[PDB]
Amino acid sequence: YDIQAWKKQCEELLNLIFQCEDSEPFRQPVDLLEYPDYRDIIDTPMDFATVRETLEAGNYESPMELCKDVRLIFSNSKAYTPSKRSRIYSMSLRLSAFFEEHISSVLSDYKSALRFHKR
Numbered sequence: 001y002d003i004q005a006w007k008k009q010c011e012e013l014l015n016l017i018f019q020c021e022d023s024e025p026f027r028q029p030v031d032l033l034e035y036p037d038y039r040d041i042i043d044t045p046m047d048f049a050t051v052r053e054t055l056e057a058g059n060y061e062s063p064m065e066l067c068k069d070v071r072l073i074f075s076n077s078k079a080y081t082p083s084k085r086s087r088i089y090s091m092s093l094r095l096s097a098f099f100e101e102h103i104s105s106v107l108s109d110y111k112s113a114l115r116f117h118k119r
């Protein structure tokens, strides 16, 4: 029932994501010389270094907020991809599945801890 445990759990999962080759494109921002229309399509860029920095700054209050930002990485990739068979989009879907598999217990444990706190 540790209300703070999610933060280290999210740090560890971000570490695992950074060790994944599939996270390569999503570790930093997109170069507009490489992808000059990217901000015409994507309103709110997001990447895993921004998520990690936000977490380490103490600027997430809950793992739900972190989860929303990570899901934005993946929805941006789906919005920007010209093809559902693109290399970078395909990397996003594997990484998304890995993320969702691991974040589910983090969310469940946090929400259970908050409920116990308010019992």
Ligand SMILES: O=C(NCC1=[SH]CCC1)N1CCN(C(=O)c2ccco2)CC1
Binding pocket: 024, 025, 026, 027, 028, 029, 030, 031, 034, 035, 076, 077, 078, 080, 081, 082, 086, 088, 089, 092
């Ligand atoms: O250039 C980057 N990231 C920087 C990189 S790529 C390798 C290392 C660092 N992008 C490309 C556009 N993005 C997509 O989601 C996408 C879907 C289809 C094609 O691109 C986001 C990631």
